[PDB]
Design an enzyme around this catalytic site. Structure first.
Site, mmCIF file in Angstrom:
data_model
loop_
_atom_site.group_PDB
_atom_site.id
_atom_site.type_symbol
_atom_site.label_atom_id
_atom_site.label_comp_id
_atom_site.label_asym_id
_atom_site.label_seq_id
_atom_site.Cartn_x
_atom_site.Cartn_y
_atom_site.Cartn_z
ATOM 1 N N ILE A 54 0.899 15.091 -9.676
ATOM 2 C CA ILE A 54 1.663 15.326 -8.375
ATOM 3 C C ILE A 54 2.609 14.008 -8.314
ATOM 4 C CG2 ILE A 54 0.072 16.891 -7.513
ATOM 5 C CD1 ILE A 54 -0.685 14.407 -5.664
ATOM 6 N N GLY A 57 3.951 6.426 -10.586
ATOM 7 C CA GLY A 57 4.111 5.026 -9.780
ATOM 8 C C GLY A 57 4.370 3.866 -10.989
ATOM 9 N N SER A 58 4.432 2.842 -10.395
ATOM 10 C CA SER A 58 4.700 1.377 -11.237
ATOM 11 C C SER A 58 3.525 1.294 -12.157
ATOM 12 C CB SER A 58 4.924 0.416 -10.293
ATOM 13 O OG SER A 58 4.377 0.571 -9.023
ATOM 14 N N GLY A 60 0.989 3.662 -12.845
ATOM 15 C CA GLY A 60 0.412 4.702 -13.255
ATOM 16 C C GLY A 60 0.750 6.139 -12.470
ATOM 17 N N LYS A 77 -5.592 8.915 -9.018
ATOM 18 C CA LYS A 77 -4.812 7.733 -9.804
ATOM 19 C C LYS A 77 -5.259 7.428 -11.158
ATOM 20 C CE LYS A 77 -2.057 3.797 -8.125
ATOM 21 N NZ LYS A 77 -1.916 2.909 -6.943
ATOM 22 N N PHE A 124 -7.067 12.669 -0.341
ATOM 23 C CA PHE A 124 -5.755 13.477 -0.488
ATOM 24 C C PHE A 124 -5.032 13.280 0.602
ATOM 25 C CE2 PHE A 124 -3.198 17.507 -0.821
ATOM 26 C CZ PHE A 124 -1.926 16.777 -1.234
ATOM 27 N N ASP A 167 3.152 -5.268 -1.102
ATOM 28 C CA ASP A 167 4.124 -3.975 -1.180
ATOM 29 C C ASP A 167 4.326 -3.188 0.030
ATOM 30 O OD1 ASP A 167 6.092 -2.788 -2.825
ATOM 31 O OD2 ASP A 167 4.585 -1.479 -3.506
ATOM 32 N N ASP A 185 -1.082 1.228 -0.534
ATOM 33 C CA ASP A 185 -0.907 0.964 -2.033
ATOM 34 C C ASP A 185 -1.471 -0.412 -2.203
ATOM 35 O OD1 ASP A 185 -0.417 2.165 -4.175
ATOM 36 O OD2 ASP A 185 1.977 1.759 -3.891
HETATM 37 N N1 LIG Z 1 -4.104 9.734 -1.860
HETATM 38 C C1 LIG Z 1 -2.978 10.272 -2.033
HETATM 39 N N2 LIG Z 1 -2.679 11.401 -1.450
HETATM 40 C C2 LIG Z 1 -1.335 11.696 -1.353
HETATM 41 N N3 LIG Z 1 -0.472 11.338 -2.232
HETATM 42 C C3 LIG Z 1 -0.490 10.327 -3.091
HETATM 43 C C4 LIG Z 1 -2.048 9.628 -2.944
HETATM 44 N N4 LIG Z 1 -1.837 8.260 -3.682
HETATM 45 C C5 LIG Z 1 -0.653 8.406 -4.303
HETATM 46 N N5 LIG Z 1 0.099 9.368 -3.637
HETATM 47 C C6 LIG Z 1 1.617 9.696 -4.135
HETATM 48 O O1 LIG Z 1 1.852 9.319 -5.315
HETATM 49 C C7 LIG Z 1 2.378 8.098 -5.748
HETATM 50 C C8 LIG Z 1 1.491 7.267 -6.677
HETATM 51 O O2 LIG Z 1 1.921 5.490 -6.625
HETATM 52 P P1 LIG Z 1 1.105 4.640 -5.808
HETATM 53 O O3 LIG Z 1 2.100 4.427 -4.513
HETATM 54 O O4 LIG Z 1 -0.159 5.303 -5.412
HETATM 55 O O5 LIG Z 1 1.102 3.560 -6.753
HETATM 56 P P2 LIG Z 1 1.810 2.681 -7.732
HETATM 57 O O6 LIG Z 1 3.052 2.877 -7.549
HETATM 58 O O7 LIG Z 1 1.244 3.348 -9.208
HETATM 59 O O8 LIG Z 1 1.472 0.858 -7.738
HETATM 60 P P3 LIG Z 1 0.852 -0.083 -6.519
HETATM 61 O O9 LIG Z 1 -0.160 0.475 -5.877
HETATM 62 O O10 LIG Z 1 0.710 -1.154 -7.437
HETATM 63 O O11 LIG Z 1 2.375 -0.234 -5.698
HETATM 64 C C9 LIG Z 1 3.023 7.595 -4.565
HETATM 65 O O12 LIG Z 1 4.286 7.372 -4.549
HETATM 66 C C10 LIG Z 1 2.568 8.677 -3.501
HETATM 67 O O13 LIG Z 1 3.697 9.353 -2.913
HETATM 68 MG MG LIG Z 2 3.435 3.112 -3.824
#
Ligand SMILES: Nc1ncnc2c1ncn2[C@@H]1O[C@H](COP(=O)(O)OP(=O)(O)OP(=O)(O)O)[C@@H](O)[C@H]1O
Ligand SMILES: [Mg+2]
Length: 316
Positions: A54, A57-58, A60, A77, A124, A167, A185
């Site tokens: 769904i 990310g940077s 994963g 994640k 979530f 961030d 994040d």
């Molecule tokens: N618990 C959650 N519930 C709903 N959506 C999520 C959740 N965690 C992440 N997401 C969505 O998925 C994406 C996952 O990337 P996330 O921001 O978690 O980390 P990243 O970019 O991989 O690395 P970093 O944490 O180092 O910035 C996000 O852009 C967010 O919109």
């Molecule tokens: Mg992020």
């Protein structure tokens, strides 16, 4: 990298590649074994159905998934050990969320090692990211105040133990369906303590980077506060300053210029104006702490969760 309008973080630190930007077998097995000891043992695939990607990310990908026994939804994640910009930062994804239960921090259930991936099972957030809202809508001060309050409550706690988020931007703030607001994040955190006063690593998203961080000087929890300033600019003006310029050109400007001002001060309260002046202060020692900011008159404007609900995509 350069195109501009880029939301993607940038991760280096304290070396020559980080100067350049002024204009394996052994290590892996060791690193994997260490993680293995740190995470919860087991395999979540044994208790979770329905993995659907769904989000990207940077570091994963994110999938939703189903607690088999209960029907309950969780987000997962998944991060590759071999595909990380700075492998060691992955410890954050595990340790931080665990150590910081709080109404404004996304909850983490468990973490596992799966193949060469780190997997974190976390709550979530059905509300989506703030970014969506900011890029397609205009928050009023009541809603803006509610957002900062939540973020600031979380940051106060992280900064209390000298944890820098590195961030802070809308993409990092998530929402529940009932208008609650959580910071999310923790991939790129660093820590300071009595014996490591500052940090020097160049980590963050260019447009949101504090100017002392860009000037490769030693920094502290203060950088997060500058970034928060920039996030306020998003909520008001829709995008950060110099967004249309390429990241490298934007940074140059951030280092050199005076703190950015809002497009149109005609309709913004002096209360909010005065708030933002406390955030976007070039000299960190002058710039306000999250502790201090929590007491700023502006945040008394903060509306209840119910007043965030109408901003979410489902209700536009
Ligand atoms: N618990 C959650 N519930 C709903 N959506 C999520 C959740 N965690 C992440 N997401 C969505 O998925 C994406 C996952 O990337 P996330 O921001 O978690 O980390 P990243 O970019 O991989 O690395 P970093 O944490 O180092 O910035 C996000 O852009 C967010 O919109
Ligand atoms: Mg992020």
């Amino acid at each position: 990298l350069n195109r501009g309008r880029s939301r993607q973080p940038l991760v280096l630190g304290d070396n020559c590649f980080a100067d350049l930007v002024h204009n394996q077998r052994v290590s892996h097995e060791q690193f994997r074994a260490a993680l293995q000891l740190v995470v919860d043992p087991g395999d979540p695939r044994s208790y979770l159905d329905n993995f659907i990607k769904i989000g990207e990310g940077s570091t994963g990908i994110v999938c939703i998934a189903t607690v088999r026994s209960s029907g309950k939804l969780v987000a997962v994640k998944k991060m590759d050990l071999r595909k990380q910009q700075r492998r060691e930062l992955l410890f954050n994804e595990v340790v931080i969320m665990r150590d910081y239960q709080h109404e404004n921090v996304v909850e983490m259930y468990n973490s596992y090692l799966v193949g060469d991936e780190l997997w974190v099972v976390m709550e979530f957030l059905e509300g989506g990211a703030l970014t969506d809202i900011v890029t397609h809508t205009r928050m009023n001060e009541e809603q803006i105040a509610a957002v900062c309050l939540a973020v600031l409550q979380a940051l106060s706690v992280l900064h209390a133990q000298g944890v820098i988020h590195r961030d802070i931007k809308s993409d990092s703030i998530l929402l529940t369906h009932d208008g609650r607001v959580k910071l999310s994040d923790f991939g790129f955190c660093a820590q300071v303590s009595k014996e490591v006063p500052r940090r020097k690593s160049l980590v963050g998203t260019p447009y949101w980077m504090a100017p002392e961080l860009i000037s490769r000087l030693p920094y502290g929890p203060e950088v997060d506060i500058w970034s928060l300033g920039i996030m306020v600019i998003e909520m008001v003006d829709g995008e950060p300053p110099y967004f249309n310029e390429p990241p490298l050109k934007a940074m140059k400007m951030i280092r050199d210029n005076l703190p950015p001002r809002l497009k149109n001060l005609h309709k913004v309260s002096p209360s909010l104006k005065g708030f933002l002046d406390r955030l976007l202060v070039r000299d960190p020692a002058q710039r306000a702490t999250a502790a201090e900011l929590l007491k700023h008159p502006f945040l008394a404007k903060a509306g209840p969760p119910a007043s965030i609900v109408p901003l979410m995509r489902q209700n536009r």
